[PDB]
Amino acid sequence: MVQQKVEVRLKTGLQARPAALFVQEANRFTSDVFLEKDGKKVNAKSIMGLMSLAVSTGTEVTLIAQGEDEQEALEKLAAYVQEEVLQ
Amino acid sequence: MVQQKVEVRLKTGLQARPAALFVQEANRFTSDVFLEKDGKKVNAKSIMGLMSLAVSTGTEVTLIAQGEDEQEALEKLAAYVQEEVLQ
């Protein structure tokens, strides 16, 4: 048996389950939603799109919502992304 | 339209493409190969397994190989994970 400590230099992104639950929450709203980081914007109602953004836990991203209920959508989704969901 | 810069506290992991290439390389070896971090261990010959470990680009993890070709497996995969290239 052998082992070696290594630095992950490969690209990371949101894991599948939290991306899928983010989309379930976003689906409760009619607004379109996006995430953007460093000039790359993805459709936040797409699990594959969400997972494609290069992100690491603790990093900053910009959440964007546009539509009739955009204000409510943004508040719910910001809480979700920041792990500050209300009871 | 409304926007908000938020901190991503959700879990992240390897993206699909880099995990698929990791598995393509790992499957060539007879040794069992795992990635381990904070007491969680995943199979490096599994795309969904690799993607299930919480990691961020830059994070240090432990690569483990056990088997007849464990040394060559460790060497090949450590180079892959760390984005190291041949002279």
Distance CA B20, CA B35 (A): 14
Resolution of the structure, angstroms: 1.8
Which 8-state DSSP code applies to residue A66? E
| Helix boundaries (H) for chain B | 16-26, 47-51, 70-81
Residue of A nearest to B78 (CA): A6
Q: Report helix, strand or coil for B2.
A: strand
Distance CA B55, CA A84 (A): 21
| Domain CATH code at residue B28 | 3.30.1340.10
Distance CA B27, CA A86 (A): 44
Residues 6+ away with beta carbon under 8 Å from B2: A64, A65, A66, A70, A71, A74
The tally of domains found in chain A comes to 1
Residue A64 sits at the chain B interface (C-beta within 8 Å): yes
Residue of A nearest to B68 (CA): A1
CB contact under 8 A, B1 and A58: no
The token duo for A31 is: 């607004």
**CA of A85, closest CA in chain B: separation in Å?**
12
Distance CA B61, CA B74 (A): 13
Domain that holds residue B51: 2-87
Q: Which helix (H) or strand (E) holds A49?
A: helix A47-52
Q: Report helix, strand or coil for A13.
A: strand
Distance CA A43, CA A49 (A): 6
